[PDB]
Amino acid sequence: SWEVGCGAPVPLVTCDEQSPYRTITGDCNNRRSPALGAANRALARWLPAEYEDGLAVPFGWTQRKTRNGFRVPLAREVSNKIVGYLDEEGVLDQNRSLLFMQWGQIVDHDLDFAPETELGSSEHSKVQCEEYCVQGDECFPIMFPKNDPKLKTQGKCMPFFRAGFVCPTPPYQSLARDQINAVTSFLDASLVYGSEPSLASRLRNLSSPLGLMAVNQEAWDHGLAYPPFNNVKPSPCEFINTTAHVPCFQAGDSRASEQILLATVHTLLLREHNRLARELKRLNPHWDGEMLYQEARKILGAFIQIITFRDYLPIVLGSEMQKWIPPYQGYNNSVDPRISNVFTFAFRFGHMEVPSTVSRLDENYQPWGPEAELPLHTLFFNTWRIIKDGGIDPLVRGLLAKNSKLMNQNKMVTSELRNKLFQPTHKVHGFDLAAINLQRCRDHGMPGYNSWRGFCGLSQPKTLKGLQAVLKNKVLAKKLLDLYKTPDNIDIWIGGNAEPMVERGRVGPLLACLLGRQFQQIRDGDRFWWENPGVFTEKQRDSLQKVSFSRLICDNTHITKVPLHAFQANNYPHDFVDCSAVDKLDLSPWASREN
Numbered sequence: 001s002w003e004v005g006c007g008a009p010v011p012l013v014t015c016d017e018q019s020p021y022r023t024i025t026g027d028c029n030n031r032r033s034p035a036l037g038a039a040n041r042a043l044a045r046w047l048p049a050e051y052e053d054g055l056a057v058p059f060g061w062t063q064r065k066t067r068n069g070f071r072v073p074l075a076r077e078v079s080n081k082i083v084g085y086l087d088e089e090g091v092l093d094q095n096r097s098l099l100f101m102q103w104g105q106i107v108d109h110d111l112d113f114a115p116e117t118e119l120g121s122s123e124h125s126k127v128q129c130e131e132y133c134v135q136g137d138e139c140f141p142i143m144f145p146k147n148d149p150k151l152k153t154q155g156k157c158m159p160f161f162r163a164g165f166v167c168p169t170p171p172y173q174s175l176a177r178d179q180i181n182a183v184t185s186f187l188d189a190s191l192v193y194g195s196e197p198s199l200a201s202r203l204r205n206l207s208s209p210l211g212l213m214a215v216n217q218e219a220w221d222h223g224l225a226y227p228p229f230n231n232v233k234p235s236p237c238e239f240i241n242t243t244a245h246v247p248c249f250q251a252g253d254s255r256a257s258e259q260i261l262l263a264t265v266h267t268l269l270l271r272e273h274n275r276l277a278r279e280l281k282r283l284n285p286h287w288d289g290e291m292l293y294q295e296a297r298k299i300l301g302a303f304i305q306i307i308t309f310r311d312y313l314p315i316v317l318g319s320e321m322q323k324w325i326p327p328y329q330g331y332n333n334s335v336d337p338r339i340s341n342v343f344t345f346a347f348r349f350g351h352m353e354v355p356s357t358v359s360r361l362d363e364n365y366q367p368w369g370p371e372a373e374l375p376l377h378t379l380f381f382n383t384w385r386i387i388k389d390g391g392i393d394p395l396v397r398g399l400l401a402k403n404s405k406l407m408n409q410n411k412m413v414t415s416e417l418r419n420k421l422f423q424p425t426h427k428v429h430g431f432d433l434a435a436i437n438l439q440r441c442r443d444h445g446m447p448g449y450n451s452w453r454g455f456c457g458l459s460q461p462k463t464l465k466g467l468q469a470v471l472k473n474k475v476l477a478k479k480l481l482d483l484y485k486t487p488d489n490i491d492i493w494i495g496g497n498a499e500p501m502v503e504r505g506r507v508g509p510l511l512a513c514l515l516g517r518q519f520q521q522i523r524d525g526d527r528f529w530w531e532n533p534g535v536f537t538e539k540q541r542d543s544l545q546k547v548s549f550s551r552l553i554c555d556n557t558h559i560t561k562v563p564l565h566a567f568q569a570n571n572y573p574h575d576f577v578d579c580s581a582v583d584k585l586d587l588s589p590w591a592s593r594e595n
């Protein structure tokens with residue numbers, strides 16, 4: 001191979017070798033090999049990178065060059081022809097709450113993040129992309145095909161920059177380009193506590209010995225907290241409503257303010273940390289703040305794991321769950337916990353569950369106001385609707401009462417995500433998330449749909465007749481191939497999401513596999529998975545078995561009517577009950593006595 005020890009990590013980090021707490025950066029989880037699963041490292045590769053120069057140039061970069069004898073189809077075209085649909089009627093999920101879509105993006109944000117490239121503190125190359133669509137170094141533009149309404153309106157392309165890579169950041173030239181995972185790989189509530197030591201500190205209230213997370217000093221939501229503002233200008237959140245002046249929130253994960261519902265659950269989490277930290281200083285008055293913070297951060301992680309694996313995953317993989325995530329058997333130090341590259345494209349299945357509108361219900365779960373239901377696009381980096389229009393209570397009820405959008409072969413990604421996405425750097429509400437995933441698949445060097453089919457031991461459709469067989473849909477299989485010319489070339493994201501859904505789950509054969517084994521590895525290769533003997537005392541686990549997101553809401557809001565099973569479609573009021581019916585997380589077990 002090229003080099004066993006490359007990498008520009010958060011230098012200098014030695015293992016406390018017996019401390020009952022995870023490191024903020026993920027180091028020292030695995031004793032034998034320390035950086036396994038730590039942040040700011042190359043995503044893991046399950047199959048060899050497929051680049052045009054076999055080395056780092058994306059398929060679709062030069063245009064005399066082909067992929068298996070054919071030209072790859074323009075990202076935006078695959079979008080226009082396959083992804084979009086017009087009639088939003090009937091795409092809702094009869095059995096999944098918006099929360100279902102919402103949790104997915106939290107976990108995800110906890111497990112991976114491949115940043116973009118800058119190396120420009122005061123650039124014009126940033127501009128050559130934006131204004132000229134000049135494909136060159138770190139700029140890999142998304143051109144618009146013939147007859148795209150976006151030409152008459154936006155220009156010739158949608159600016160797009162390549163993800164960040166390893167050994168350096170500047171040009172570079174050796175072993176197949178690998179992308180960076182800026183966040184730790186373990187399900188450990190990092191979107192909340194940060195991945196860099198530097199940032200993890202700034203988020204804490206080190207002004208008092210209480211292990212509390214720093215909160216907003218400028219605004220309150222009925223006496224309850226909000227995250228603090230990211231007082232860095234220029235801010236996206238500000239730009240969307242000049243008059244309002246309300247900046248983005250600041251959490252352990254930078255994508256925290258991308259959309260209104262996501263900030264909401266970020267708040268509920270920040271809120272739960274401090275509540276835990278307080279319940280613990282009432283119980284263990286002698287604890288210093290560091291033990292508070294840590295102890296709390298430990299419960300929280302346990303929280304995100306139990307919810308994710310007990311309640312979320314089973315309705316995602318369905319009949320395919322046990323085939324991939326068999327019951328726990330203990331820590332396996334020989335398992336690579338690292339998040340793979342393809343995983344970051346397989347978990348995107350979620351983009352197809354985002355409905356076109358966000359609602360705010362009042363206390364009777366009735367429409368809240370004259371502008372209760374809003375277009376999803378007016379909510380990207382919209383923080384001012386939280387702070388200045390109800391707080392998070394109205395939105396938390398939308399999550400529990402409203403449904404998620406169901407993945408459909410003829411209605412894939414809502415046009416609010418595929419025609420009007422707002423990207424923090426740019427100004428217009430005209431990006432296409434469908435095209436973006438597709439250029440990114442290519443940016444990361446993903447091998448085609450068939451290699452993955454194979455990788456997972458599934459039939460490798462080579463023909464129209466075969467593809468048809470796999471998708472149970474003659475028309476999609478035909479549009480697919482008229483564009484790709486061969487099933488070997490279909491991009492993992494679109495090919496993956498096009499399959500029908502396995503039984504009782506929400507994703508098909510190939511994604512069940514991909515998602516299936518990643519989660520199996522991060523659970524089996526985490527020295528701190530809550531069930532692994534040693535991490536939590538027997539008694540402590542017995543209360544942790546009782547957490548529920550519904551409780552998370554009850555203890556951290558003023559919603560008082562909640563469903564018992566928040567991930568499935570519940571109606572109001574038949575399915576809602578009083579918070580008192582919801583079991584609480586008893587922390588007595590954390591009580592520590594001196595003598």
Ligand code: HEM
Pocket residue numbers: 101102103104105108112113114115258259343344345347348349350351353354376417421433436437440
């Ligand atoms: C309205 C809701 C959502 C919006 C507006 C949104 C937006 C975005 C955007 C703009 C990107 C950057 C893509 C790129 O540059 O390559 C992204 C990436 C991603 N999204 Fe979505 N997303 C949403 C929901 C979800 C959901 C529900 C899931 C999963 C269940 C999900 C999973 C992912 C993953 C895994 C990435 C790449 C993360 C990384 O490796 O950096 N997203 N999203």
Ligand SMILES: *[C@@H]1O[C@H](CO)[C@@H](O[C@@H]2O[C@H](CO)[C@@H](O[C@@H]3O[C@H](CO)[C@@H](O)[C@H](O)[C@@H]3O)[C@H](O)[C@H]2NC(C)=O)[C@H](O)[C@H]1NC(C)=O
Pocket residue numbers: 240241242243244384388
């Ligand atoms: C930018 O953000 C500001 C929020 O700071 C938005 O201003 C708000 O606009 C509405 C009018 O459409 C004001 O509400 C009105 O008064 C009461 C509600 O308080 C209601 O009974 C009326 O029917 C009407 O809704 C609201 O008070 C006002 N906020 C202030 C003080 O400026 C503005 O609409 C946003 N504009 C953009 C650029 O999207």
Ligand SMILES: *[C@@H]1O[C@H](CO)[C@@H](O[C@@H]2O[C@H](CO)[C@@H](O[C@H]3O[C@H](CO)[C@@H](O)[C@H](O)[C@@H]3O)[C@H](O)[C@H]2NC(C)=O)[C@H](O)[C@H]1NC(C)=O
Pocket residue numbers: 095314315565568569
């Ligand atoms: C809407 O989604 C609900 C969430 O999955 C689902 O509830 C599920 O109900 C079935 C009832 O059979 C449970 O499945 C298990 O049922 C028994 C256990 O008593 C077993 O013998 C079966 O083999 C099976 O494993 C699920 O546990 C339960 N889901 C959860 C996690 O609460 C509803 O059935 C769905 N409603 C519709 C409209 O189909």
Ligand SMILES: *[C@@H]1O[C@H](CO)[C@@H](O[C@@H]2O[C@H](CO)[C@@H](O[C@H]3O[C@H](CO)[C@@H](O)[C@H](O)[C@@H]3O)[C@H](O)[C@H]2NC(C)=O)[C@H](O)[C@H]1NC(C)=O
Pocket residue numbers: 205207208210212213214215216217
């Ligand atoms: C860091 O932690 C500090 C202590 O936990 C916290 O100080 C306390 O902040 C709360 C809310 O800002 C204040 O509580 C209430 O004070 C009066 C009560 O008479 C109310 O009228 C106010 O509206 C407010 O809600 C406390 O006064 C304050 N306590 C102390 C010790 O001064 C800081 O706010 C925290 N800072 C950060 C960045 O999180």
Ligand SMILES: *[C@@H]1O[C@H](CO)[C@@H](O[C@@H]2O[C@H](CO)[C@@H](O)[C@H](O)[C@H]2NC(C)=O)[C@H](O)[C@H]1NC(C)=O
Pocket residue numbers: 332334335
């Ligand atoms: C830990 O998990 C690993 C990987 O899944 C298991 O290793 C297997 O070990 C057998 C020999 O005992 C080898 O033939 C394979 O290379 C491994 N299987 C695979 C597919 O990786 C191991 O069984 C687990 N360790 C323990 C003690 O539970």
Ligand SMILES: [Ca+2]
Pocket residue numbers: 110111183184185186187188189190
């Ligand atoms: Ca993590």
